């Protein structure tokens, strides 16, 4: 229960942070960069993280 409620308090606290965009991968290249489309706006390249 304590974990649940701590989670709730933090959830309220830091939901002020903005979310994320959903992009359609179009092409990939060297780990440094990978292409992706960000609907509705045009197609770009992104610097992927360490996933």
């Amino acid at each position: 229960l304590n974990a649940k409620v701590r989670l709730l308090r933090e959830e309220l606290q830091l939901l002020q942070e903005q979310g994320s965009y959903v992009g359609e991968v179009v092409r990939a290249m060297d780990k440094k960069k990978v292409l992706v489309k960000v609907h509705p706006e045009g197609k770009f390249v992104v610097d992927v993280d360490k996933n």
Binding site: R27, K32, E41, G42, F44, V45, V46, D47
Partner: protein, 371 residues
Amino acid sequence: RLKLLKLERIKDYLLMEEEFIRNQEQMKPLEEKQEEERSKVDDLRGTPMSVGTLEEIIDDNHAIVSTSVGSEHYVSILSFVDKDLLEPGCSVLLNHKVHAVIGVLMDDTDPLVTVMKVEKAPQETYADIGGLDNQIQEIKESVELPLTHPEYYEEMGIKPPKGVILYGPPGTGKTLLAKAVANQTSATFLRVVGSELIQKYLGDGPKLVRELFRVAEEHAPSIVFIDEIDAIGTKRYDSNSGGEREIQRTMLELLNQLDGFDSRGDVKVIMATNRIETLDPALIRPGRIDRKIEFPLPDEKTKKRIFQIHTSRMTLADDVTLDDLIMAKDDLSGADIKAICTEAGLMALRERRMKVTNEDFKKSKENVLYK
């Protein structure tokens, strides 16, 4: 003397470059660190969220870049760019903040080439072309040896023939010879037909014609195979009905592309026509098209050769004799011979006997004959 010049300087290249560069490599350092420094500096040059479309280029260091939202913005280019790849209409890369031109990437084109270029090396080769030695040698003179040996013409003075017409009845291996030329030549042959360029609306036909010619010039110094054109234009008529007027415009654009004001690359035109007397007298102008070639119906010996080459991949029977088919002294194109062979095979298959028979070939003859 020219050989001496080239050999001397070539040895100079080998010695200079190889020796000095290998000395530096033996002292490899002072290169990799600088390369890594430069690569990371380029990465530092903003690579966030980024893309750009090149509307046009003003000059070195300055150009206009438009985004999907119409962000036309003019920007000073960053020299890090590859440069010289900045053809208008190219997909540029732009910094998220300053929209700095730092990269360009398309790696994708209209698949018109992949549509109009199918089976670049068909199964038919000059071995598969049974007969017509004179026509074969003339078309080779016209097309291949200009390309495979660009020395004789260069040393003697003239440039090779540009357009070559192949005229004859409906079916004499015109497309076959086109295919064989494609297969034997390393150039990117282009198949084209006369029933597609007739577009629904004004300007469409000439537009695709000009695009096809530009594609031919760009991607490869190759052949363009224009099939029947008599369904197009048929000379320049009084120009009364709108459709025929537009088609006449399409031929005039073809004529400009065949020999226009500006220039023409190393792309050869090969026309295939069933009837030639009705074609534009001006289009065949000797300056543009030369080496019109008769492609007549095969004679008896040519018919023998055609049957043999068609049936090479056909285990004929011991009793099957391929002379009753040469017997017929009537219209039998190479296509007719292929149809006869295929019909004999199919009828044998239907009547369930694995081996074809003389009677089967006979029946194929009667059922392939149209008139």
